[PDB]
Amino acid sequence: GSSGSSGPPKSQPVSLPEELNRVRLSRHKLERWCHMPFFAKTVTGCFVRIGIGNHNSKPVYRVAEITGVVETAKVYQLGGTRTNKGLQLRHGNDQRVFRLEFVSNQEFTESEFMKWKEAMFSAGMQLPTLDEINKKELSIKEASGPSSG
């Protein structure tokens, strides 16, 4: 066993909801990476959109950061494929465990971002640095990228 590393990166925490959207995992990528080895490793550090609820009137969503990947006993469908990997999300200073099926695939609304930020601003936690966003993103690409645009 060995290790050693520490120090502040010195950067800005997602100046906008876009940067966060850049590293905003997608059910698809998940459904695909769900069959990849570097799944949890990758997904870990990204961001997904969870739909706490919806109801009949106004939608509801919250930004969460994947802290890891757990393993359930029950399996569920995910666009045809059946997976059993619980996405370890963290809402502010509170952890959680949702499913890919729930993991939406939309651009972090200007609200959600700010709404989620609140949890971070309340807990005094820090968001993803433009550096991490890129670095991380660069990982998403390598992981599996069809095209840029």
PDB file of all heavy atoms in Angstrom, residues 113-140:
ATOM      1  N   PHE A 113     -29.366  24.152 -10.584  1.00  0.00           N
ATOM      2  CA  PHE A 113     -27.982  24.480 -10.290  1.00  0.00           C
ATOM      3  C   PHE A 113     -27.879  25.356  -9.040  1.00  0.00           C
ATOM      4  O   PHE A 113     -27.139  25.035  -8.112  1.00  0.00           O
ATOM      5  CB  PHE A 113     -27.442  25.260 -11.491  1.00  0.00           C
ATOM      6  CG  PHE A 113     -25.956  25.608 -11.389  1.00  0.00           C
ATOM      7  CD1 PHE A 113     -25.048  24.637 -11.103  1.00  0.00           C
ATOM      8  CD2 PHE A 113     -25.543  26.888 -11.587  1.00  0.00           C
ATOM      9  CE1 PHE A 113     -23.669  24.961 -11.009  1.00  0.00           C
ATOM     10  CE2 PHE A 113     -24.164  27.211 -11.493  1.00  0.00           C
ATOM     11  CZ  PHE A 113     -23.256  26.241 -11.207  1.00  0.00           C
ATOM     12  N   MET A 114     -28.633  26.445  -9.058  1.00  0.00           N
ATOM     13  CA  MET A 114     -28.637  27.370  -7.936  1.00  0.00           C
ATOM     14  C   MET A 114     -29.280  26.734  -6.702  1.00  0.00           C
ATOM     15  O   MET A 114     -28.792  26.905  -5.586  1.00  0.00           O
ATOM     16  CB  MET A 114     -29.408  28.635  -8.320  1.00  0.00           C
ATOM     17  CG  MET A 114     -28.731  29.358  -9.486  1.00  0.00           C
ATOM     18  SD  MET A 114     -27.253  30.182  -8.917  1.00  0.00           S
ATOM     19  CE  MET A 114     -26.396  30.386 -10.469  1.00  0.00           C
ATOM     20  N   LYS A 115     -30.366  26.014  -6.945  1.00  0.00           N
ATOM     21  CA  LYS A 115     -31.080  25.352  -5.867  1.00  0.00           C
ATOM     22  C   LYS A 115     -30.144  24.359  -5.174  1.00  0.00           C
ATOM     23  O   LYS A 115     -30.078  24.316  -3.947  1.00  0.00           O
ATOM     24  CB  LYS A 115     -32.370  24.717  -6.391  1.00  0.00           C
ATOM     25  CG  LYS A 115     -33.445  25.779  -6.634  1.00  0.00           C
ATOM     26  CD  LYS A 115     -34.088  26.219  -5.317  1.00  0.00           C
ATOM     27  CE  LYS A 115     -34.992  27.435  -5.528  1.00  0.00           C
ATOM     28  NZ  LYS A 115     -36.375  27.004  -5.831  1.00  0.00           N
ATOM     29  N   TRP A 116     -29.443  23.587  -5.991  1.00  0.00           N
ATOM     30  CA  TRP A 116     -28.513  22.598  -5.472  1.00  0.00           C
ATOM     31  C   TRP A 116     -27.365  23.342  -4.787  1.00  0.00           C
ATOM     32  O   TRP A 116     -26.941  22.966  -3.696  1.00  0.00           O
ATOM     33  CB  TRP A 116     -28.039  21.657  -6.581  1.00  0.00           C
ATOM     34  CG  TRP A 116     -26.635  21.091  -6.359  1.00  0.00           C
ATOM     35  CD1 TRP A 116     -26.267  20.088  -5.550  1.00  0.00           C
ATOM     36  CD2 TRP A 116     -25.416  21.541  -6.989  1.00  0.00           C
ATOM     37  NE1 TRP A 116     -24.908  19.858  -5.613  1.00  0.00           N
ATOM     38  CE2 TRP A 116     -24.375  20.771  -6.516  1.00  0.00           C
ATOM     39  CE3 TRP A 116     -25.203  22.566  -7.927  1.00  0.00           C
ATOM     40  CZ2 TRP A 116     -23.046  20.943  -6.925  1.00  0.00           C
ATOM     41  CZ3 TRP A 116     -23.870  22.726  -8.325  1.00  0.00           C
ATOM     42  CH2 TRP A 116     -22.809  21.958  -7.859  1.00  0.00           C
ATOM     43  N   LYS A 117     -26.895  24.385  -5.457  1.00  0.00           N
ATOM     44  CA  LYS A 117     -25.804  25.185  -4.926  1.00  0.00           C
ATOM     45  C   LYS A 117     -26.107  25.552  -3.472  1.00  0.00           C
ATOM     46  O   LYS A 117     -25.224  25.499  -2.618  1.00  0.00           O
ATOM     47  CB  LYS A 117     -25.542  26.395  -5.823  1.00  0.00           C
ATOM     48  CG  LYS A 117     -24.253  26.212  -6.628  1.00  0.00           C
ATOM     49  CD  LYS A 117     -24.242  27.122  -7.859  1.00  0.00           C
ATOM     50  CE  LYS A 117     -24.018  28.582  -7.459  1.00  0.00           C
ATOM     51  NZ  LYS A 117     -22.802  29.117  -8.112  1.00  0.00           N
ATOM     52  N   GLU A 118     -27.360  25.914  -3.235  1.00  0.00           N
ATOM     53  CA  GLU A 118     -27.791  26.289  -1.899  1.00  0.00           C
ATOM     54  C   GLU A 118     -27.272  25.281  -0.871  1.00  0.00           C
ATOM     55  O   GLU A 118     -26.666  25.663   0.128  1.00  0.00           O
ATOM     56  CB  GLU A 118     -29.314  26.412  -1.828  1.00  0.00           C
ATOM     57  CG  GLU A 118     -29.820  27.508  -2.767  1.00  0.00           C
ATOM     58  CD  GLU A 118     -30.468  28.648  -1.980  1.00  0.00           C
ATOM     59  OE1 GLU A 118     -29.705  29.394  -1.328  1.00  0.00           O
ATOM     60  OE2 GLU A 118     -31.712  28.749  -2.046  1.00  0.00           O
ATOM     61  N   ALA A 119     -27.530  24.011  -1.153  1.00  0.00           N
ATOM     62  CA  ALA A 119     -27.098  22.946  -0.265  1.00  0.00           C
ATOM     63  C   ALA A 119     -25.592  23.064  -0.029  1.00  0.00           C
ATOM     64  O   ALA A 119     -25.116  22.849   1.085  1.00  0.00           O
ATOM     65  CB  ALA A 119     -27.490  21.593  -0.865  1.00  0.00           C
ATOM     66  N   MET A 120     -24.883  23.406  -1.095  1.00  0.00           N
ATOM     67  CA  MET A 120     -23.440  23.556  -1.017  1.00  0.00           C
ATOM     68  C   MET A 120     -23.060  24.837  -0.271  1.00  0.00           C
ATOM     69  O   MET A 120     -22.114  24.845   0.515  1.00  0.00           O
ATOM     70  CB  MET A 120     -22.853  23.596  -2.429  1.00  0.00           C
ATOM     71  CG  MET A 120     -23.350  22.412  -3.263  1.00  0.00           C
ATOM     72  SD  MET A 120     -22.325  20.982  -2.965  1.00  0.00           S
ATOM     73  CE  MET A 120     -20.721  21.666  -3.350  1.00  0.00           C
ATOM     74  N   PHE A 121     -23.820  25.888  -0.543  1.00  0.00           N
ATOM     75  CA  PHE A 121     -23.575  27.172   0.092  1.00  0.00           C
ATOM     76  C   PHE A 121     -23.984  27.141   1.567  1.00  0.00           C
ATOM     77  O   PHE A 121     -23.417  27.860   2.387  1.00  0.00           O
ATOM     78  CB  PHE A 121     -24.434  28.205  -0.640  1.00  0.00           C
ATOM     79  CG  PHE A 121     -23.800  28.741  -1.925  1.00  0.00           C
ATOM     80  CD1 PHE A 121     -23.341  27.877  -2.869  1.00  0.00           C
ATOM     81  CD2 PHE A 121     -23.695  30.083  -2.124  1.00  0.00           C
ATOM     82  CE1 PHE A 121     -22.752  28.374  -4.062  1.00  0.00           C
ATOM     83  CE2 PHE A 121     -23.107  30.580  -3.316  1.00  0.00           C
ATOM     84  CZ  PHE A 121     -22.647  29.717  -4.260  1.00  0.00           C
ATOM     85  N   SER A 122     -24.965  26.299   1.858  1.00  0.00           N
ATOM     86  CA  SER A 122     -25.457  26.165   3.218  1.00  0.00           C
ATOM     87  C   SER A 122     -24.475  25.337   4.050  1.00  0.00           C
ATOM     88  O   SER A 122     -24.162  25.694   5.185  1.00  0.00           O
ATOM     89  CB  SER A 122     -26.846  25.522   3.241  1.00  0.00           C
ATOM     90  OG  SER A 122     -27.456  25.615   4.526  1.00  0.00           O
ATOM     91  N   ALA A 123     -24.016  24.248   3.453  1.00  0.00           N
ATOM     92  CA  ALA A 123     -23.075  23.366   4.125  1.00  0.00           C
ATOM     93  C   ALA A 123     -21.676  23.983   4.069  1.00  0.00           C
ATOM     94  O   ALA A 123     -20.764  23.524   4.754  1.00  0.00           O
ATOM     95  CB  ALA A 123     -23.128  21.978   3.483  1.00  0.00           C
ATOM     96  N   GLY A 124     -21.551  25.012   3.244  1.00  0.00           N
ATOM     97  CA  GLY A 124     -20.277  25.696   3.088  1.00  0.00           C
ATOM     98  C   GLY A 124     -19.323  24.884   2.210  1.00  0.00           C
ATOM     99  O   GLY A 124     -18.134  25.189   2.134  1.00  0.00           O
ATOM    100  N   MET A 125     -19.880  23.867   1.569  1.00  0.00           N
ATOM    101  CA  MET A 125     -19.093  23.010   0.699  1.00  0.00           C
ATOM    102  C   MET A 125     -18.724  23.734  -0.597  1.00  0.00           C
ATOM    103  O   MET A 125     -19.277  24.790  -0.901  1.00  0.00           O
ATOM    104  CB  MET A 125     -19.891  21.746   0.369  1.00  0.00           C
ATOM    105  CG  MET A 125     -20.004  20.834   1.593  1.00  0.00           C
ATOM    106  SD  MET A 125     -21.631  20.104   1.661  1.00  0.00           S
ATOM    107  CE  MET A 125     -21.722  19.397   0.024  1.00  0.00           C
ATOM    108  N   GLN A 126     -17.794  23.137  -1.327  1.00  0.00           N
ATOM    109  CA  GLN A 126     -17.345  23.712  -2.584  1.00  0.00           C
ATOM    110  C   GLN A 126     -17.864  22.884  -3.762  1.00  0.00           C
ATOM    111  O   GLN A 126     -18.083  21.681  -3.630  1.00  0.00           O
ATOM    112  CB  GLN A 126     -15.819  23.823  -2.622  1.00  0.00           C
ATOM    113  CG  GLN A 126     -15.309  24.748  -1.516  1.00  0.00           C
ATOM    114  CD  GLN A 126     -14.174  25.639  -2.026  1.00  0.00           C
ATOM    115  OE1 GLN A 126     -13.801  25.609  -3.186  1.00  0.00           O
ATOM    116  NE2 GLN A 126     -13.647  26.429  -1.095  1.00  0.00           N
ATOM    117  N   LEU A 127     -18.045  23.561  -4.886  1.00  0.00           N
ATOM    118  CA  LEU A 127     -18.533  22.904  -6.085  1.00  0.00           C
ATOM    119  C   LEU A 127     -17.345  22.449  -6.933  1.00  0.00           C
ATOM    120  O   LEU A 127     -16.195  22.565  -6.510  1.00  0.00           O
ATOM    121  CB  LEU A 127     -19.511  23.812  -6.834  1.00  0.00           C
ATOM    122  CG  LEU A 127     -20.284  24.817  -5.977  1.00  0.00           C
ATOM    123  CD1 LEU A 127     -20.455  26.148  -6.711  1.00  0.00           C
ATOM    124  CD2 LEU A 127     -21.626  24.234  -5.526  1.00  0.00           C
ATOM    125  N   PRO A 128     -17.670  21.928  -8.147  1.00  0.00           N
ATOM    126  CA  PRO A 128     -16.641  21.455  -9.058  1.00  0.00           C
ATOM    127  C   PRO A 128     -15.913  22.628  -9.718  1.00  0.00           C
ATOM    128  O   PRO A 128     -16.547  23.541 -10.244  1.00  0.00           O
ATOM    129  CB  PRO A 128     -17.375  20.573 -10.055  1.00  0.00           C
ATOM    130  CG  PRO A 128     -18.842  20.955  -9.948  1.00  0.00           C
ATOM    131  CD  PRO A 128     -19.019  21.775  -8.681  1.00  0.00           C
ATOM    132  N   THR A 129     -14.590  22.563  -9.670  1.00  0.00           N
ATOM    133  CA  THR A 129     -13.768  23.608 -10.257  1.00  0.00           C
ATOM    134  C   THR A 129     -13.658  23.413 -11.771  1.00  0.00           C
ATOM    135  O   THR A 129     -13.514  22.287 -12.246  1.00  0.00           O
ATOM    136  CB  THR A 129     -12.415  23.603  -9.543  1.00  0.00           C
ATOM    137  OG1 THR A 129     -12.122  22.219  -9.366  1.00  0.00           O
ATOM    138  CG2 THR A 129     -12.503  24.151  -8.117  1.00  0.00           C
ATOM    139  N   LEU A 130     -13.729  24.525 -12.486  1.00  0.00           N
ATOM    140  CA  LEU A 130     -13.638  24.490 -13.935  1.00  0.00           C
ATOM    141  C   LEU A 130     -12.534  23.516 -14.350  1.00  0.00           C
ATOM    142  O   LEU A 130     -12.609  22.902 -15.413  1.00  0.00           O
ATOM    143  CB  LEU A 130     -13.455  25.903 -14.495  1.00  0.00           C
ATOM    144  CG  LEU A 130     -14.666  26.833 -14.379  1.00  0.00           C
ATOM    145  CD1 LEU A 130     -15.973  26.040 -14.430  1.00  0.00           C
ATOM    146  CD2 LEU A 130     -14.571  27.702 -13.124  1.00  0.00           C
ATOM    147  N   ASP A 131     -11.532  23.406 -13.489  1.00  0.00           N
ATOM    148  CA  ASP A 131     -10.413  22.517 -13.752  1.00  0.00           C
ATOM    149  C   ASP A 131     -10.897  21.067 -13.700  1.00  0.00           C
ATOM    150  O   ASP A 131     -10.633  20.288 -14.615  1.00  0.00           O
ATOM    151  CB  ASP A 131      -9.315  22.688 -12.700  1.00  0.00           C
ATOM    152  CG  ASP A 131      -7.889  22.712 -13.253  1.00  0.00           C
ATOM    153  OD1 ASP A 131      -7.760  22.641 -14.494  1.00  0.00           O
ATOM    154  OD2 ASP A 131      -6.960  22.800 -12.421  1.00  0.00           O
ATOM    155  N   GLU A 132     -11.595  20.748 -12.621  1.00  0.00           N
ATOM    156  CA  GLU A 132     -12.118  19.404 -12.438  1.00  0.00           C
ATOM    157  C   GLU A 132     -13.131  19.074 -13.536  1.00  0.00           C
ATOM    158  O   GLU A 132     -13.108  17.981 -14.099  1.00  0.00           O
ATOM    159  CB  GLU A 132     -12.743  19.243 -11.051  1.00  0.00           C
ATOM    160  CG  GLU A 132     -11.817  18.455 -10.122  1.00  0.00           C
ATOM    161  CD  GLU A 132     -12.606  17.429  -9.304  1.00  0.00           C
ATOM    162  OE1 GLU A 132     -13.705  17.798  -8.840  1.00  0.00           O
ATOM    163  OE2 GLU A 132     -12.089  16.300  -9.161  1.00  0.00           O
ATOM    164  N   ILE A 133     -13.996  20.040 -13.809  1.00  0.00           N
ATOM    165  CA  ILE A 133     -15.015  19.866 -14.831  1.00  0.00           C
ATOM    166  C   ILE A 133     -14.356  19.384 -16.125  1.00  0.00           C
ATOM    167  O   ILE A 133     -14.756  18.365 -16.686  1.00  0.00           O
ATOM    168  CB  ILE A 133     -15.831  21.149 -14.997  1.00  0.00           C
ATOM    169  CG1 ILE A 133     -16.464  21.572 -13.670  1.00  0.00           C
ATOM    170  CG2 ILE A 133     -16.874  20.996 -16.107  1.00  0.00           C
ATOM    171  CD1 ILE A 133     -17.937  21.161 -13.609  1.00  0.00           C
ATOM    172  N   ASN A 134     -13.359  20.139 -16.561  1.00  0.00           N
ATOM    173  CA  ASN A 134     -12.642  19.802 -17.779  1.00  0.00           C
ATOM    174  C   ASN A 134     -11.948  18.450 -17.598  1.00  0.00           C
ATOM    175  O   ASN A 134     -12.246  17.495 -18.313  1.00  0.00           O
ATOM    176  CB  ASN A 134     -11.568  20.845 -18.092  1.00  0.00           C
ATOM    177  CG  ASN A 134     -11.267  20.889 -19.592  1.00  0.00           C
ATOM    178  OD1 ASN A 134     -10.198  20.520 -20.048  1.00  0.00           O
ATOM    179  ND2 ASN A 134     -12.268  21.360 -20.331  1.00  0.00           N
ATOM    180  N   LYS A 135     -11.034  18.412 -16.639  1.00  0.00           N
ATOM    181  CA  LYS A 135     -10.297  17.193 -16.355  1.00  0.00           C
ATOM    182  C   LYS A 135     -11.263  16.007 -16.346  1.00  0.00           C
ATOM    183  O   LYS A 135     -11.055  15.027 -17.060  1.00  0.00           O
ATOM    184  CB  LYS A 135      -9.493  17.342 -15.061  1.00  0.00           C
ATOM    185  CG  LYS A 135      -8.192  18.106 -15.310  1.00  0.00           C
ATOM    186  CD  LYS A 135      -7.386  18.251 -14.017  1.00  0.00           C
ATOM    187  CE  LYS A 135      -6.263  17.213 -13.951  1.00  0.00           C
ATOM    188  NZ  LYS A 135      -6.065  16.751 -12.560  1.00  0.00           N
ATOM    189  N   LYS A 136     -12.299  16.135 -15.530  1.00  0.00           N
ATOM    190  CA  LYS A 136     -13.298  15.086 -15.419  1.00  0.00           C
ATOM    191  C   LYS A 136     -13.882  14.795 -16.803  1.00  0.00           C
ATOM    192  O   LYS A 136     -13.793  13.671 -17.295  1.00  0.00           O
ATOM    193  CB  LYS A 136     -14.350  15.458 -14.373  1.00  0.00           C
ATOM    194  CG  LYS A 136     -15.567  14.533 -14.466  1.00  0.00           C
ATOM    195  CD  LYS A 136     -15.135  13.069 -14.568  1.00  0.00           C
ATOM    196  CE  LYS A 136     -14.687  12.533 -13.208  1.00  0.00           C
ATOM    197  NZ  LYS A 136     -14.686  11.053 -13.207  1.00  0.00           N
ATOM    198  N   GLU A 137     -14.468  15.827 -17.392  1.00  0.00           N
ATOM    199  CA  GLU A 137     -15.066  15.697 -18.710  1.00  0.00           C
ATOM    200  C   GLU A 137     -14.138  14.912 -19.639  1.00  0.00           C
ATOM    201  O   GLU A 137     -14.544  13.911 -20.226  1.00  0.00           O
ATOM    202  CB  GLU A 137     -15.400  17.069 -19.299  1.00  0.00           C
ATOM    203  CG  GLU A 137     -16.357  16.937 -20.485  1.00  0.00           C
ATOM    204  CD  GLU A 137     -17.368  15.812 -20.252  1.00  0.00           C
ATOM    205  OE1 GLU A 137     -17.978  15.814 -19.162  1.00  0.00           O
ATOM    206  OE2 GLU A 137     -17.507  14.975 -21.171  1.00  0.00           O
ATOM    207  N   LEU A 138     -12.909  15.397 -19.743  1.00  0.00           N
ATOM    208  CA  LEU A 138     -11.921  14.754 -20.591  1.00  0.00           C
ATOM    209  C   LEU A 138     -11.960  13.242 -20.357  1.00  0.00           C
ATOM    210  O   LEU A 138     -11.628  12.463 -21.250  1.00  0.00           O
ATOM    211  CB  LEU A 138     -10.539  15.374 -20.369  1.00  0.00           C
ATOM    212  CG  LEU A 138     -10.110  16.435 -21.384  1.00  0.00           C
ATOM    213  CD1 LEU A 138     -10.413  15.981 -22.813  1.00  0.00           C
ATOM    214  CD2 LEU A 138     -10.747  17.789 -21.064  1.00  0.00           C
ATOM    215  N   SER A 139     -12.369  12.872 -19.153  1.00  0.00           N
ATOM    216  CA  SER A 139     -12.458  11.468 -18.790  1.00  0.00           C
ATOM    217  C   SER A 139     -13.687  10.835 -19.445  1.00  0.00           C
ATOM    218  O   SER A 139     -13.629   9.700 -19.915  1.00  0.00           O
ATOM    219  CB  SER A 139     -12.515  11.294 -17.271  1.00  0.00           C
ATOM    220  OG  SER A 139     -11.767  10.162 -16.835  1.00  0.00           O
ATOM    221  N   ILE A 140     -14.771  11.596 -19.455  1.00  0.00           N
ATOM    222  CA  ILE A 140     -16.013  11.124 -20.043  1.00  0.00           C
ATOM    223  C   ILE A 140     -15.784  10.813 -21.524  1.00  0.00           C
ATOM    224  O   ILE A 140     -16.213   9.771 -22.016  1.00  0.00           O
ATOM    225  CB  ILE A 140     -17.141  12.126 -19.793  1.00  0.00           C
ATOM    226  CG1 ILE A 140     -17.632  12.049 -18.345  1.00  0.00           C
ATOM    227  CG2 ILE A 140     -18.280  11.933 -20.796  1.00  0.00           C
ATOM    228  CD1 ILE A 140     -17.019  13.165 -17.498  1.00  0.00           C
TER     229      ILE A 140
END
